[PDB]
Amino acid sequence: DIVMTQSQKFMSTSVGDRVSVTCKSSQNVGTNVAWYQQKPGQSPKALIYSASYRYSGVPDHFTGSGSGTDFTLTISNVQSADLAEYFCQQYNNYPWTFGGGTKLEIKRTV
Amino acid sequence: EVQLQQSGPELVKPGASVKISCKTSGYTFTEYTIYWVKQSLGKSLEWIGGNNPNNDDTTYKQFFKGKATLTVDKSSSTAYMELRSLTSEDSAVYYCARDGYPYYYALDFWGQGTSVTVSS
Amino acid sequence: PNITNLCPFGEVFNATRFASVYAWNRKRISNCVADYSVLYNSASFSTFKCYGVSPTKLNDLCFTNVYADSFVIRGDEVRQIAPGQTGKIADYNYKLPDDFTGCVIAWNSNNLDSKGNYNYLYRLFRKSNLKPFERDISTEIYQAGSTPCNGVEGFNCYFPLQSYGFQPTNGVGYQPYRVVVLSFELLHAPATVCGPKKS
Numbered sequence A: 001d002i003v004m005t006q007s008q009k010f011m012s013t014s015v016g017d018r019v020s021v022t023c024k025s026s027q028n029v030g031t032n033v034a035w036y037q038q039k040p041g042q043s044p045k046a047l048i049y050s051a052s053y054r055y056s057g058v059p060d061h062f063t064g065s066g067s068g069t070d071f072t073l074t075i076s077n078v079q080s081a082d083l084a085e086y087f088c089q090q091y092n093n094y095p096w097t098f099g100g101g102t103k104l105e106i107k108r109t110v
Numbered sequence B: 001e002v003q004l005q006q007s008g009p010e011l012v013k014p015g016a017s018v019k020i021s022c023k024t025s026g027y028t029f030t031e032y033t034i035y036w037v038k039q040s041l042g043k044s045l046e047w048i049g050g051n052n053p054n055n056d057d058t059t060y061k062q063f064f065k066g067k068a069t070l071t072v073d074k075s076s077s078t079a080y081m082e083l084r085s086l087t088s089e090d091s092a093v094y095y096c097a098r099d100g101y102p103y104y105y106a107l108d109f110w111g112q113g114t115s116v117t118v119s120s
Numbered sequence C: 001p002n003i004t005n006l007c008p009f010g011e012v013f014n015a016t017r018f019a020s021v022y023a024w025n026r027k028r029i030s031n032c033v034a035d036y037s038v039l040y041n042s043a044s045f046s047t048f049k050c051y052g053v054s055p056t057k058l059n060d061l062c063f064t065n066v067y068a069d070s071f072v073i074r075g076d077e078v079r080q081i082a083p084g085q086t087g088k089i090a091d092y093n094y095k096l097p098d099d100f101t102g103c104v105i106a107w108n109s110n111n112l113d114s115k116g117n118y119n120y121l122y123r124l125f126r127k128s129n130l131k132p133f134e135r136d137i138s139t140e141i142y143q144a145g146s147t148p149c150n151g152v153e154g155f156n157c158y159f160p161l162q163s164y165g166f167q168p169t170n171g172v173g174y175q176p177y178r179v180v181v182l183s184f185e186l187l188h189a190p191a192t193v194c195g196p197k198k199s
Helices: C037-041 C075-080 C088-092
Strands: A010-012 A019-022 A033-038 A045-049 A072-075 A085-090 A102-105 B003-006 B010-012 B017-025 B034-039 B046-051 B058-060 B070-073 B078-084 B092-098 B114-118 C025-029 C047-049 C064-073 C103-108 C177-185
Touching: A045 A072, B003 B092, B010 B017, B017 B034, B017 B092, B017 B114, B046 B070, C064 C075, C075 C088, C075 C177
Parallel strands: A010 A102, B010 B114
Antiparallel strands: A019 A072, A033 A045, A033 A085, A085 A102, B003 B017, B017 B078, B034 B046, B034 B092, B046 B058, B070 B078, B092 B114, C025 C064, C047 C103, C064 C177, C103 C177
16 A cells, blocks of 8 residues: 555664665556655755756766665765755655654764 | 755654755746655655645655645744644754756755654 | 629538538639629628738739638637638647748638527647647547546547537627638739739
8 A cells, every 4th residue: 555664764874884765665556756855843854856867056976776565765975965864755645744754873982 | 056955853752743945046936846854864865755846736755644744834934734643763963955947857856854853 | 894703702602501600611713704792792791801912802812722711709709810810720720830821711600590590610729839720630538637538528628619608698708600711822824813804
């Protein structure tokens, strides 16, 4: 029916390692998604469009995925302004419903 | 040249009716629809609904009954939400967004949001 | 000579049934001799806006392969039919190029559609403006939303064709108007239709 879990709720990357988040959807309804960044306190900022495109207003160094019923997104690296929430989109039927979101945590060591 | 100025935080009472205004200025209002969503303090995002400025159409989600009402006006070039039955958990932030049909689908532009808190 | 070969040019103006505005009717007239002066002489022609040449010079000059475009519009839309102007009908139903040396006639037909008439369709939604002299005939569910449109009509899924409220108890702006536009090319190589000559 309508369910979005992307196989995870939050992920942690310490230093240097590339970050990638999937957007696994329900059964075949279509191929149209988006990814938004949510900084802690202000309005969401769009990250990726249709999982493989570019933004004029963003310094885009991103890697996407193909098509079908599964989606994936890869971001450049873990910079100093990456700690935020990750939201995926699904716009096929009028009752729009998103997932639980993904949280990126910078795993500081001892 | 797209901007959106909303209202400030509000304190509501259970079993009452309150109003929220989304103001749009600096660009034409007729073509693109306006979408309403909510955030309940960092939880999952819910699509409250959407409305069409021209056809005056209104669309909701599967479970929205209780405050299912929209309106828009072109003289003030804004939109009004009416909230009813603020029972126990509607304390959250409302976000008003606009999409683009020629380019930049899926809610390109957002707003600052209005935080409504329920209390006795 | 007698040259009495009057052509159906004088018949299309008295046709009981016309076509829709978006599927505007086109007629090609040639190889005939007819008098153009008898049109504006009658007092039954409400609107006559004729840009290509003065009305009294139609008979003086000779043309070729004359084309007539006929349709029906609303009462308060006659100003939309002009070369290089705005208008919903002028954008999605019928548009005149700026370099148009043509002639336009329009007259009321209120008594011919009294009860009223609910068989008229017109385009309202289109991706862009129409091309000059474009016979754009097609049907599709117009979409105006980010989400794709498929299946049954709904939000951001509309029918681009609508009827006319031509009630028999309406004034100016709701009375049907028959509109005809005459165009022609001047002496491409041969000459077939010219003005009448008296002896």
